Amino acid sequence: GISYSVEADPDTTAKAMLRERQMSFKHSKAIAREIKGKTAGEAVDYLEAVIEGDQPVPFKQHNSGVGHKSKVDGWDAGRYPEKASKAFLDLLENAVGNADHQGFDGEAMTIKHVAAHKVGEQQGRKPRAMGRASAWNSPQVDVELILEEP
Template structure:
């Protein structure tokens, strides 16, 4: 595994805490939309939101990748979906972030997410054999997610 850095600028080890998820098989589009939505929330509020997404009570608003996405009845959400697999991975990442904050001696109730970023990871190339000696590519893009929180 390579040496990874963080894209968050202005990191102060005394005020900030960070956690990352590397090379996960989740949709980078879903991860981007979740990251955009939970930025600015407290950790508890973000966890409640992600639990509601898994239970299909709240939808994640899609802002960039919204073509052919149906509208939802949530207030303030036009196009949206319920990315359960990505939401479950984000909950694990929030648990990791809280553990890191607890290790640093920070107050968990005052943590606010100030940086949430999703990047495309490596491309896993595979091929499906077809008739007449042909093959069809089946590619899988892994995803990196970074969270940075600040004690308010």
């Protein structure tokens, strides 16, 4: 697994992590990218809107064949990855909770750092025609989050 790739002052910071999550790593890069700089509470409201289908997540890198979305500003392709979004909500619920237990105002803290990392693949095999089998794997994702006072 990963370790926090960024320095964090304990007196003004809160941390959280997700480990070996079986979810789309590509959806994860997109979500992290979009919620960084936001307030913990803002991110939560954002992700809930994504899950609801009222707010699209811009797909700037992994966008092949992705249909354009009108609510996407400055870009075109976007989607509503609910699974990875739900996992991020768990990450934020934990972070904000850790933050509160430390005396901070969890929700009001800024997302100083958020990043997904592909830690591996749960390997699978799919039988194909002609007596042959091919890979059918599941990505494993770690994600760090550092909340900071503003």
